[PDB]
Amino acid sequence: KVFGRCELAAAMKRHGLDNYRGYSLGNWVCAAKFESNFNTQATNRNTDGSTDYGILQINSRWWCNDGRTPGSRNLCNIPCSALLSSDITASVNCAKKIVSDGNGMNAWVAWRNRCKGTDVQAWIRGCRL
Template sequence: MSRLLLVWVALTLIDSSQQHARVFNRCQLSRELLRYNFPRAQIANWVCLIEHASGRTTDKVTNHNNAYTSFGLFQINNKEWCKKGKRGGHCNMKCEDLLNEDLNDDVRCAKRIYDRVGFKNWPASFAYCKDKSLPDLSKC
């Protein structure tokens, strides 16, 4: 009986330590952004940026050639905005906290970035969206 209990505890610990990711479709993502009070007029821009940055996936990690890494749905980097393994950066958060389904901290940081530098923080991704045809969200 105690062996069964040990197995159950081990499996529970393993399961609770894993990151839970979410992949959004366009409509789900646009609804989430509206729920977090992103300006309606910018939703298509944000959806486009997120599609090109992370593929609408919350657990995306991108290692860059410049020794920095981008994390999560918004691909927020550890150069300025978060720190690996500990709270820090301009968003005062651990980068790993950007890799789960809970978008509260991701949104808070993305909005802080946008308020400071606009879409310039995401130059490669936003290049796909600026002055181009944005995602059609009319069916959402």
């Protein structure tokens, strides 16, 4: 599924991401835009052999099991395929575990480089929330 901007904002708010660990909703929408272009089916392979999955590009070396990343830790206890669903529940629940780790949203490269320190409120402006 390719989400609309406000449609995704509304889903993320329902699932409790607005101000989760202090990150306002615009931060999460911005991250999703630049990680996946709002596409739940996005995948990207890394040089170390791991793969990033879904709307928030969660990585198979630490967070989910895809059966082909030796030494995966599967800290979210899910198959990586579950992160490609049109239902973003599993991605949100796993993202909550990731952002509670020491580095916050700096774990997402696209957030650090394209959203941090910008006007992220713009990503939810106009939306009925």
